Design an enzyme around this catalytic site. Sequence first.
Site, PDB file in Angstrom:
ATOM      1  N   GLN A 174      -4.973 -17.295  -2.451  1.00 40.52           N
ATOM      2  CA  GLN A 174      -5.237 -16.517  -3.651  1.00 40.52           C
ATOM      3  C   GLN A 174      -6.469 -16.983  -4.427  1.00 40.52           C
ATOM      4  OE1 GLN A 174      -3.987 -13.781  -2.990  1.00 40.52           O
ATOM      5  NE2 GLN A 174      -3.081 -13.325  -4.990  1.00 40.52           N
ATOM      6  N   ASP A 214      -9.205  -0.795  -7.424  1.00 41.24           N
ATOM      7  CA  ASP A 214      -8.442  -1.019  -6.206  1.00 41.24           C
ATOM      8  C   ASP A 214      -7.739  -2.380  -6.223  1.00 41.24           C
ATOM      9  OD1 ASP A 214      -9.244  -1.138  -2.644  1.00 41.24           O
ATOM     10  OD2 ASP A 214      -7.454  -0.441  -3.685  1.00 41.24           O
ATOM     11  N   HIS A 261       0.753   1.543  -5.706  1.00 39.29           N
ATOM     12  CA  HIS A 261      -0.572   0.941  -5.605  1.00 39.29           C
ATOM     13  C   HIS A 261      -1.602   1.970  -6.035  1.00 39.29           C
ATOM     14  CE1 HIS A 261      -4.257  -0.901  -4.323  1.00 39.29           C
ATOM     15  NE2 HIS A 261      -4.455  -0.019  -3.361  1.00 39.29           N
ATOM     16  N   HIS A 299       0.795  -1.226   0.000  1.00 37.77           N
ATOM     17  CA  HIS A 299       0.000   0.000   0.000  1.00 37.77           C
ATOM     18  C   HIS A 299       0.829   1.279   0.000  1.00 37.77           C
ATOM     19  CE1 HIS A 299      -2.973  -2.946   1.773  1.00 37.77           C
ATOM     20  NE2 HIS A 299      -3.587  -2.496   0.694  1.00 37.77           N
ATOM     21  N   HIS A 319      -6.855   7.298  -2.495  1.00 36.40           N
ATOM     22  CA  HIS A 319      -7.633   6.340  -1.702  1.00 36.40           C
ATOM     23  C   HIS A 319      -6.927   5.606  -0.542  1.00 36.40           C
ATOM     24  CE1 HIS A 319      -5.932   2.852  -3.823  1.00 36.40           C
ATOM     25  NE2 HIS A 319      -6.562   2.103  -2.934  1.00 36.40           N
ATOM     26  N   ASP A 320      -5.596   5.585  -0.527  1.00 32.72           N
ATOM     27  CA  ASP A 320      -4.869   4.914   0.553  1.00 32.72           C
ATOM     28  C   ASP A 320      -3.819   5.814   1.182  1.00 32.72           C
ATOM     29  OD1 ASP A 320      -5.839   2.223   1.099  1.00 32.72           O
ATOM     30  OD2 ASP A 320      -4.996   1.578  -0.820  1.00 32.72           O
TER      31      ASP A 320
HETATM   32  C1  VDN Z   1      -5.312  -5.181   1.063  1.00 28.38           C
HETATM   33  C2  VDN Z   1      -5.715  -6.651   1.181  1.00 28.38           C
HETATM   34  C3  VDN Z   1      -6.614  -7.068  -0.011  1.00 28.38           C
HETATM   35  C4  VDN Z   1      -5.891  -7.450  -1.296  1.00 28.38           C
HETATM   36  N1  VDN Z   1      -5.616  -6.684  -2.301  1.00 28.38           N
HETATM   37  C5  VDN Z   1      -4.940  -7.563  -3.221  1.00 28.38           C
HETATM   38  C6  VDN Z   1      -4.426  -7.095  -4.578  1.00 28.38           C
HETATM   39  C7  VDN Z   1      -4.817  -8.863  -2.737  1.00 28.38           C
HETATM   40  C8  VDN Z   1      -4.285 -10.203  -3.094  1.00 28.38           C
HETATM   41  O1  VDN Z   1      -3.716 -10.476  -4.131  1.00 28.38           O
HETATM   42  N2  VDN Z   1      -4.509 -11.169  -2.083  1.00 28.38           N
HETATM   43  C9  VDN Z   1      -5.134 -10.976  -0.886  1.00 28.38           C
HETATM   44  C10 VDN Z   1      -5.313 -12.073   0.082  1.00 28.38           C
HETATM   45  C11 VDN Z   1      -6.523 -12.278   0.635  1.00 28.38           C
HETATM   46  C12 VDN Z   1      -6.767 -13.376   1.609  1.00 28.38           C
HETATM   47  S1  VDN Z   1      -8.371 -13.541   2.272  1.00 28.38           S
HETATM   48  O2  VDN Z   1      -8.303 -13.097   3.648  1.00 28.38           O
HETATM   49  O3  VDN Z   1      -9.237 -12.740   1.429  1.00 28.38           O
HETATM   50  N3  VDN Z   1      -8.812 -15.141   2.189  1.00 28.38           N
HETATM   51  C13 VDN Z   1      -9.051 -15.666   3.552  1.00 28.38           C
HETATM   52  C14 VDN Z   1      -9.515 -17.138   3.538  1.00 28.38           C
HETATM   53  N4  VDN Z   1     -10.710 -17.346   2.681  1.00 28.38           N
HETATM   54  C15 VDN Z   1     -11.155 -18.748   2.676  1.00 28.38           C
HETATM   55  C16 VDN Z   1     -12.154 -19.136   3.794  1.00 28.38           C
HETATM   56  C17 VDN Z   1     -10.407 -16.890   1.305  1.00 28.38           C
HETATM   57  C18 VDN Z   1      -9.982 -15.404   1.308  1.00 28.38           C
HETATM   58  C19 VDN Z   1      -5.736 -14.224   1.966  1.00 28.38           C
HETATM   59  C20 VDN Z   1      -4.396 -14.032   1.383  1.00 28.38           C
HETATM   60  C21 VDN Z   1      -4.145 -13.018   0.472  1.00 28.38           C
HETATM   61  O4  VDN Z   1      -2.939 -12.743  -0.141  1.00 28.38           O
HETATM   62  C22 VDN Z   1      -1.703 -13.450   0.035  1.00 28.38           C
HETATM   63  C23 VDN Z   1      -0.732 -12.717  -0.896  1.00 28.38           C
HETATM   64  N5  VDN Z   1      -5.609  -9.742  -0.590  1.00 28.38           N
HETATM   65  N6  VDN Z   1      -5.460  -8.732  -1.461  1.00 28.38           N
HETATM   66 MG    MG Z   2      -7.546   1.302   1.567  1.00 29.50          MG
HETATM   67 ZN    ZN Z   3      -6.179   0.162  -1.963  1.00 25.23          ZN
END
Ligand code: VDN
Ligand code: MG
Ligand code: ZN
Length: 313
Positions: free
Chosen positions: A270, A217, A81, A77, A117-118
């Site tokens: 992912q 985003d 980004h 962030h 935004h961030d």
């Molecule tokens: C700022 C955080 C959000 C965000 N922006 C981007 C581009 C990304 C990205 O690539 N990856 C993540 C990202 C999101 C999660 S989660 O919390 O959404 N996950 C939890 C478990 N459940 C299953 C029950 C599925 C969902 C977990 C791991 C993540 O990334 C590892 C690199 N988050 N993320």
């Molecule tokens: Mg934000």
């Molecule tokens: Zn953002």
Amino acid sequence: TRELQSLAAAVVPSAQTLKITDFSFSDFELSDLETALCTIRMFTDLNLVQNFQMKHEVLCRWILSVKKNYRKNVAYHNWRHAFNTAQCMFAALKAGKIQNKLTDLEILALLIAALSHDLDHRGVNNSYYCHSIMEHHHFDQCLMILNSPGNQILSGLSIEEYKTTLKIIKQAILATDLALYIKRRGEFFELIRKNQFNLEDPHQKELFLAMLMTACDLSAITKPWPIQQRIAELVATEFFDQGDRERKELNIEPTDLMNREKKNKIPSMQVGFIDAICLQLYEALTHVSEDCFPLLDGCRKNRQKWQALAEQQ
Ligand SMILES: CCCc1nc(C)c2c(=O)nc(-c3cc(S(=O)(=O)N4CCN(CC)CC4)ccc3OCC)[nH]n12
Ligand SMILES: [Mg+2]
Ligand SMILES: [Zn+2]
């Protein structure tokens, strides 16, 4: 300053030359100066510069002020980004033909929201209502930068246009709160499924602008494999870094999502992220405009890549 002078006197290449119209854009090999130039080109080609009589020097100062208020030491962030989120906005607007759908004031606000935004993110992230506390700080930081002397790019807007654009900006930034996304998408998806989505509708417009904000985003989840993999590591680094700091300052064990060990699970993670959060959004955006298909297409290809790894792992 020397940096302001260089930016204001530099030649701003064409959008085509900067390749900021394609959803496959990547900033990796661009210098900080080149990104700012791209940013200027964005305000330019969306006709915001002339339609709102922006003074070139003031736009440059603002762009530098916004880039400054981002902390480089924060893995994911940061300025890059924010810059990419804004570049996706531009691409969607142009290549995605979303521009004819919005008003110049909505566009002006969205571009600004995208870039700020961030603002001043500290690397403290969530899981999935927290009342958008983080997002509120990002707005105050944005409002402030827009008021600082010589940074007032919104000068030239009547009092009402200013009051209007400000609301839209506030909303777009807060919209980037995933908690809000989860809350509002249900309605959005239903309107798209019932083929009764209507942008002519004030509320449905506010909902669209929110959804669009979130799509940009997370644009990284739709980028080409090389790029996606490269950014997922920045994201992963931020999370793990947070888990360490949290186990340090507090005596709380990190969630698998945030502790460095258990990193072998990012592929699995992912996939879940894409399935539960991204895919629906991009498939829905494609329903609003088929020209956005590239986003959905790349999101899908990314899932195939992560799925393979999660097994081969
Ligand atoms: C700022 C955080 C959000 C965000 N922006 C981007 C581009 C990304 C990205 O690539 N990856 C993540 C990202 C999101 C999660 S989660 O919390 O959404 N996950 C939890 C478990 N459940 C299953 C029950 C599925 C969902 C977990 C791991 C993540 O990334 C590892 C690199 N988050 N993320
Ligand atoms: Mg934000
Ligand atoms: Zn953002």
